[PDB]
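Hi support team,

I'm opening this ticket because the web form for multi-chain structure prediction keeps timing out on my end. I have pasted the exact lines I submitted so you can reproduce it. The total is 692 residues across five entries, so I didn't expect it to be a heavy job. Is there a limit I'm missing, or should I split the entries? Thanks in advance, R.K.
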Amino acid sequence: APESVADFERLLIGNPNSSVVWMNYMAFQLQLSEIEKARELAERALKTINFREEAEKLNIWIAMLNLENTFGTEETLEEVFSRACQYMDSYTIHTKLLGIYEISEKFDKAAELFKATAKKFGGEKVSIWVSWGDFLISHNEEQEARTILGNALKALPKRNHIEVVRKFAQLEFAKGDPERGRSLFEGLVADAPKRIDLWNVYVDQEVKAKDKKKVEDLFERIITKKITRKQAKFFFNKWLQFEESEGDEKTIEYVKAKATEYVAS
Amino acid sequence: ESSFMTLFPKYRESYLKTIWNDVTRALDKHNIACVLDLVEGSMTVKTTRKTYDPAIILKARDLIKLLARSVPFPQAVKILQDDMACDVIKIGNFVTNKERFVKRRQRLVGPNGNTLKALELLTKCYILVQGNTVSAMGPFKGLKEVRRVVEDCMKNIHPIYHIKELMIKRELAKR
Amino acid sequence: SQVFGVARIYASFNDTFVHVTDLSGKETIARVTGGMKVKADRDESSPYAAMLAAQDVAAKCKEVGITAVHVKIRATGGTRTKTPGPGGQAALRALARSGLRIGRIEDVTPVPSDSTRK
Amino acid sequence: KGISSSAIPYSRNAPAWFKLSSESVIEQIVKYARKGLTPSQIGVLLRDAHGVTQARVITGNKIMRILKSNGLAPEIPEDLYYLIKKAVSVRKHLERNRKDKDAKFRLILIESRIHRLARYYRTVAVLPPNWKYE
RNA sequence: UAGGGACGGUCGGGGGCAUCAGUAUUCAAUUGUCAGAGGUGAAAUUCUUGGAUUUAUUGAAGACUAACUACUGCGAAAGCAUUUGCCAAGGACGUUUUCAUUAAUCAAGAACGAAAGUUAGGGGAUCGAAGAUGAUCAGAUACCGUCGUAGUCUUAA
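Hello R.K., no limit was hit. The queue was backed up. Here is the completed structure from your submission:
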């Protein structure tokens, strides 16, 4: 392959905008102990890429940032993010910096990047809340994760805080606490009392985390609840599929019984 | 000892020079002194040794800044009695664009001035919509009513709703 | 010869507060907020309630030892009315009438400085 | 839009205080132009320091023709060159802070103004076809 | 005294990023003091002797840029007011600089955003974020493929 300072320049005449091949050539030069020509390739990749194609420039920035996080410097990673900011939106560049810090396993730099997100993008939207929840969940403090997510949800609007709470509950069912996930699910079903979009989210999260007696019973309550025929049959069929995955034929039949009870009125 | 001061715009000096002796007679009855400076364009007011009412320097301060904010002398002197006060409503920070701002402010004024004059009659106040603020002199119930009608007029609801409910509340408090 | 408190009177609409701390403000003396002297729940912002509160404030200031008071008159401020209510004049008039010397009138109402309403 | 341009005199003559030679002007022009200087800058420096009024009056002909006859031609005409470099400067500034929509709008303007004199230069065939704005 | 481009000193609350400041508001901590304090035309829900309200010292949060602020400025319009720096840009003027008709008006198409979702009853046929399912890559909930909730539909606020 193209993996030098001569052969890569000679063989890149067909595709000068080759982002992945330029990243592989830069990593091959860095493994070949040429950090100077590696960084030269990583900086000239976005220049040999087109101007209007911002994603290729962001890929060259991520390649130089990964090379700096592996065998470079934090100043080069900040240049790579300023470069990322010179190749894209500043919040996405700082999130790429947080990802490079998480790949370099610097916990203090990861927390500082999540805090710099949770100020500006935390007052903007919920992506910084998701980033703070990701950092504190990898740090294994779900209390501080939920506190930072609630703080960023207070800083940002609250109209997407319901889906943020459902995402927090699904993440807690995935790799956190199941009682905390069920509590956040009940809080989300309280905040959306008119919408069963939190009820099906709770049922799917419990069935994903193998809480069958939770998921099928709550979905049976939702199917026999104040719903229509389609809204009852969907929840009851999902609960019956979860109950048959657990091994409960009579409960899968009683789910359809509650569906027939709620569809006829 | 106390001293306050406002500074007034240049076009007011030919009026303030005229009514200044009446200012001196309306404050020397309260035993409190005042100068106006014509070269720096200011009106200051000082508590002298013969002053036994300490609150009157605050009302004299409100008087000279009303003479700054362009309210006539016989309209302005009613601050000097106790059941009368100022309020300066701020309206500039409600809506974004200039077109809707001046249309809602002209809505606060009214066709031919009818909304503003009916509001003065109902609230027993003196109201000047001016620039991007609304000055008002009146009793404190009138100040409360004029603040709620102006701050709800900068929101979409028409102030003749408030004129209607003020007439309803007057003839509904008359039982 | 005079020893000074500070009045810290607060003439909101719907109430009047007379709260005369020492010259720092850390240590308070004789808070007699209006709506407790006489309450019909309306007259709590009235000059009569303000002068009752100021007179027994001055009684406790004289029993502690304070003979003169720097007076700070504060309206409800913020993003609201910003003008003192009916009781701010009557409170300091009653504090001056009931033997207590008055100094240094100043308005410390919170002018909101480019506030938050959008 | 405003009336802001230059006012060429009624005289097509040498200014009669201009004792300097009518060939050393051309040598000074080719000195600046092969030390690498654009023709508007040639004309304004020849005006300001080695003071000529404009060289079409004092020399035989205009200075882009002087450069072309002295073998010193530009690859691309000057107006199109400066519009190209302004477009690529604002394009590098755009591929940077992707939220400067205003600069996106004025990139639309600069490219729409590229194409006008580019197709003018194609119909005159100053620079040839198969030139398609990189 | 058509048009375009260069230069020069600039001009502007034009834009993007970063920085800095301001005092309110809200919350928390620490005191001091005690019985009430919101709010209203009156009241009430609410806050309250693990001390509220007020006062003082802080800290944190998200906004926002008071006056100055104008029949003023800038922007193609929507719009744009704290400082400083960077990134490009724009306009008027000055010009004895350059090119030489390079020009004017508007049918498709777009970036913009002032430009939206306040609470409730109801039908869900389709689609369907949220949730989950198999391979790509040191790393892939997107890519490819489906089940599937609100919503997408309606009516008043």
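A quick check on our side: The interface with chain D takes residues 51-52, 54, 57, 85-90 of chain A (CB under 8 Å). Let us know if the file doesn't open in your viewer.
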